[PDB]
Ligand binder design. Sequence first.
Ligand SMILES: NC(=S)Nc1ccccc1OC(F)(F)F
Ligand SMILES: [Cl-]
Length: 115
Amino acid sequence: KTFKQRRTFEQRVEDVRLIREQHPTKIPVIIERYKGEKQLPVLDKTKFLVPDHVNMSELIKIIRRRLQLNANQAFFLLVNGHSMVSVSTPISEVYESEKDEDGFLYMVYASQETF
Ligand SMILES: NC(=S)Nc1ccccc1OC(F)(F)F
Ligand SMILES: [Cl-]
């Protein structure tokens, strides 16, 4: 069901290596709906190439636009299992400290801050 489940550590590593080769300026991001989530829809896909200059605040806006949410629907985004300490950090910086050992940056979203 979840991404890590569907692809071997070997396969995830090689896809990150291909994104480096073909999209050197993009951060490889996995974005998944919390398996408990009731309100928010599921995304059209799982794997995103994010321009390395966008900050977490702009990534949240991007995903809210992708889900086509409205002003008073809630949205929380966990990175590498935990709350973001700041939304102003460039995703290049966030990647370097929060990346998985496979090379992806893992994110999960929910309507509840209590995931
Ligand atoms: N659409 C995605 S997933 N990423 C993206 C972002 C900005 C420009 C182009 C993009 O696609 C590309 F990475 F495939 F090039
Ligand atoms: Cl590129």
